[PDB]
Structure 1
Amino acid sequence: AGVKAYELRTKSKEQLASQLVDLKKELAELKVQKLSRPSLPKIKTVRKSIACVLTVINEQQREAVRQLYKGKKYQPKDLRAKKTRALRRALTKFEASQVTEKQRKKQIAFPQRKYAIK
């Protein structure tokens, strides 16, 4: 059938590591059997289980690190948002919104007015 990642997300770090090894053992066993038999398609299910478990392990370990840098200025580049190189170099909303005191005063004194012709 295969493992299901919603079931794995309940599990602990150690339980998952243990399961990962049981799958790696199982996969080896089938690689041997494949030599004898003509066709052996069960091996696909266990390849994908391994890949599932590693995905979940990595998710857990990353979310742990996201918590460790909660709120801190500077976090690992791999947890920073990707966007694009050019977007990451752009001025922030704050920087782009800055006006000098001279211009702030003019903007208050003389905003564009709403008006209509009759």
Structure 2
Amino acid sequence: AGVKAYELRTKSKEQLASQLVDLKKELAELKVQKLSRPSLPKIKTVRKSIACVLTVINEQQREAVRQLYKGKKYQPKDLRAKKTRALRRALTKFEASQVTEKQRKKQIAFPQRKYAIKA
């Protein structure tokens, strides 16, 4: 029924590479068989297993690189958050919350008060 990503995540990158090689060999033999046998659908399962193995390999490699770049500024661009271009160009929360000393003093001295009418 194909490979499972949660089973592949328990394996090392060497085991994943060897499983990918075996899956490629199996797919090659299956497409050789497809020339004679009509309507052979196992090649779809083998293709999806290859895709899953490659996905898990890429996941492990990218997690290792994320750990290598943890905490430090200038992460790789494909590892940075993909918001929109305008959102990534927008001022951070620290900026546009920056205020001058005069403005901070006056907004501390005279904040918007809470007041109710009672008549």
TM-score (structure 2 length as normaliser) = 0.98
Counterpart secondary structure, 2:77: coil
For residues 21-68 of structure 1, the C-alpha deviation after alignment (integer angstroms, 9 at most, x for no partner) is 000000000101101111101110000000000000000000000000
Residue 107 of structure 1 and its aligned partner are, at CA, apart by: 0.5
Runs of 4+ in 1 over 2 A off after TM superposition: none
Counterpart secondary structure, 1:116: strand
Distance in 2, matches of 1:80 and 1:55, equals 19
Specify every segment of 5 or more residues in structure 2 that has no aligned partner in the other structure, as ranges: none
* Other-structure match for 1:75: 75
Distance in 2, matches of 1:18 and 1:58, equals 15
Q: Share of identical aligned residues, percent?
A: 100
The two structures, once aligned, show a CA RMSD in angstroms of 0.5
- Count residues with an aligned counterpart: 118
Of residues 58-67 and 35-44 in structure 1, the stretch that sits farther from structure 2 once superposed is 35-44
